[PDB]
Amino acid sequence: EVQLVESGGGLVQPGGSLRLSCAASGYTFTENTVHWVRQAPGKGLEWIGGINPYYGGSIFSPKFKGRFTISADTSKNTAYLQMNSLRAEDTAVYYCARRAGAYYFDYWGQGTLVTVSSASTKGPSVFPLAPSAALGCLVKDYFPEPVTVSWNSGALTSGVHTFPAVLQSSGLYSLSSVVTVPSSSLGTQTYICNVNHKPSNTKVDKKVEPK
């Protein structure tokens, strides 16, 4: 089973550098090229470049030749994207992707966010949204994106609406995650919202009961 797992995203100050990695598994590494493709928020897909680990060579789109380099470590079945002199325009979700056949990308990594901003990392506070059936939790004042929310450690998934983060006038983000439940189960089952903010190494678990 072929899989590409990315890591190394995060926050970088304008002019800074960052290194992304793409760990490939489930196939003979040297048999396929690995490419990088990015997506600025709310925009389209943009090809950056890719490496061929059999020949050990890489190629780039003309807009990125210069600033970025791509390497591969065959022993670890990992490709790397080394970025330098990043600007706010480089803020995007970065995907890696495997080429197969007639130059199509058949397997993609999961994406990792790279935010270029002089701002500093802040963890979120988590407040309950009390039923009285709709309940949920508010995830306030964090930077940068993203935050992940689950309910009852993944057990509760249906009826869940986790809203896109909003940027507040303070420059921090906020979102709510909400879930509809049966009008009469408020006594018996317990509902906890699980919040994850990796840029700040924060993990909070919040219990939501009626007041």
Binding site: V37, P62, F127, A130, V166, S176
Partner: protein, 211 residues
């Protein structure tokens, strides 16, 4: 360099409808080297069709592609609600580029939102801010007016909205509206209300609480 001009940038169609998306190559692109991707919100792009007309593994037969000279077409013969996504063509010709994308939205019958309102939690006032959350759940169409009224005075400039992506099963949207005050100002008012206007409601729906 070869560029792909994709149109339309968005469309809305009903379940069962036939949908056609066009990518026009700025000069000749080989049939072998034009591919289509489907990207669902929050997900990596997925290979949909490769080399103009070949269905990727596990793609349903309602998807097809063809070529006519420099013009490539992606067709969905019978739109399913889970086909909500952005579709991208991609060419290879030395370098790679993508079309700008087509966002396919589902048209469905009107659905009134369920309106809920949430007061700030105790834990949040202890921090010196009060967030009041108005939740509109599972509605169609997307356009909805949310008005905040504090002691029946109409608010302005102190709230912000977030809306979810169209649900892949029932095609409804969900919306959150958050009113932010300092705790100090929350305590100098009694009645907090949000009034919802939507096509599916005969009369505006107000949801409220007294502090």
């Amino acid at each position: 360099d070869i560029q792909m001009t994709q149109s339309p940038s968005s469309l809305s169609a009903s379940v069962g409808d036939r949908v056609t998306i066009t990518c026009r190559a700025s000069s000749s692109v080989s049939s072998s080297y034009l591919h289509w991707y489907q990207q669902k919100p929050g997900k990596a792009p997925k290979l949909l069709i490769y080399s103009t007309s070949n269905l990727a593994s596990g793609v349903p037969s309602r998807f097809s592609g063809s070529r006519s000279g420099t013009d490539f077409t992606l067709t969905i013969s019978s739109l399913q609600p889970e086909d909500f996504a952005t579709y991208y063509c991609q060419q290879y010709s030395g370098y790679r580029t993508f079309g700008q994308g087509t966002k396919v939205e589902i048209k469905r019958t009107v659905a009134a939102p369920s309106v809920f309102i949430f007061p700030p939690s105790d834990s949040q006032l202890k921090s010196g801010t009060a967030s009041v959350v108005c939740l509109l759940n599972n509605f169609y169409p997307r356009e909805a007016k949310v008005q905040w009224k504090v002691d029946n005075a109409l608010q302005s400039g102190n709230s912000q909205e977030s809306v979810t992506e169209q649900d892949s099963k029932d095609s409804t949207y969900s919306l959150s509206s958050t009113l932010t005050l300092s705790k100090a100002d929350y305590e100098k008012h009694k009645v907090y209300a949000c009034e919802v206007t939507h096509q599916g409601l005969s009369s505006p729906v107000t949801k409220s609480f007294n502090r």
